[PDB]
């Protein structure tokens, strides 16, 4: 199933814009370092995937086979906690 940060699936007609769906993960409460320095996946991959799984599960719940126009937001939330929040429009194609 296609998940894209773009407005449409080039080649495919959208049958229905079903709903806007979201997912969120709250992560735990001269050196510039990459997110994958010293590890195979990025430190935020677990958070990001939890957030995207929730969004995908909801979309699937709503009869979607695709999710377009997705955005990722990051906010430091509670006592230091990182939230990753993902939003997108569930569609039938």
């Amino acid at each position: 199933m296609i998940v894209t940060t773009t407005s449409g699936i080039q080649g495919k007609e959208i049958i229905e814009y079903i709903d806007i769906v979201n997912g969120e993960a709250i992560m735990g409460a001269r050196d510039v370092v990459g997110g994958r320095a010293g590890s195979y996946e990025s430190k935020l991959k677990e958070a990001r995937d939890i957030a995207m799984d929730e969004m995908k599960e909801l979309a699937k719940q709503k009869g979607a086979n695709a999710i377009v126009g997705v955005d990722v937001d990051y906010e430091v939330v509670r006592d230091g906690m990182l939230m990753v929040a993902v939003s997108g429009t569930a569609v039938r194609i």
Copy 2:
């Protein structure tokens, strides 16, 4: 009513761009532990987790946006964006914006 975070509705022409519409809601304060107060604080309101309350606040901000759009004679809202910001004393704000359109 069609609501999308994309810049258009494939299949339909936009007959008129009516206006830009917004909705916000701030979460309720912490009560104790992972318990958080109702976003909408009058008889009925439900306490719960940070995530269930965040989702509630995002649902009210959304519904406020849709109610304004409908007041303006819109049948669709395109180019919807969500924004999150921690404001006064740790409460989370959810703000939603989009363009109300006739299709």
Copy 3:
């Protein structure tokens, strides 16, 4: 005059991109408990004041757009950020165009 968050306008040709235009406003301070100071301005809730500031920001942007001889703003975006010790700045951005 058309103002829109979409990247374009349907059915109408842009004959000229003029300039990116912006507006901003900072929310007034907290008075007491849930009451916030106007940005004969009225005190209100956080959300009421927030809406007021966003309205001022949007008007300021349109104002700048019209004076540059535009009749439309496209690709509009709203940004929020807490500023000088607890106080929500709104900032609106857009592309002023001739249609």
Copy 4:
């Protein structure tokens, strides 16, 4: 040089997408906010021009309080040829 927040120019095909370009201005220590935004935008345009671009599309502005009293404004965009 046409600069726009839209993702596209009208009556003008993009023939090269050169790079994403960025500008930033740092303040503190509303009118100075405008100055900052201008410095960020001018810095991004300069880079775009030096890269061989004649337009910048999909422009976005971000605002961040890096410390306290310091506000950063960052603009990002795609440098293109039309």
Copy 5:
């Protein structure tokens, strides 16, 4: 590789949408402090330096996103967004996202 903040490649149809890809970089507090140059007014990121003081963080974020995309068999990344956020004790994070595609 074409990297673009736009939602498509004018002139080129997208034949496959592979994955959303992300890259990030994190700046130490010690370093963020060495960009409080604003001891006077407003200064550009390129005042007194060749490349912007944040360019290295962005380039590391962008490199990781691209390396990932490339490994997934993509030859372009579209709908790119850059995000900034202050986390833990004053470190600055720059995060980038986009859709890895095949054209």
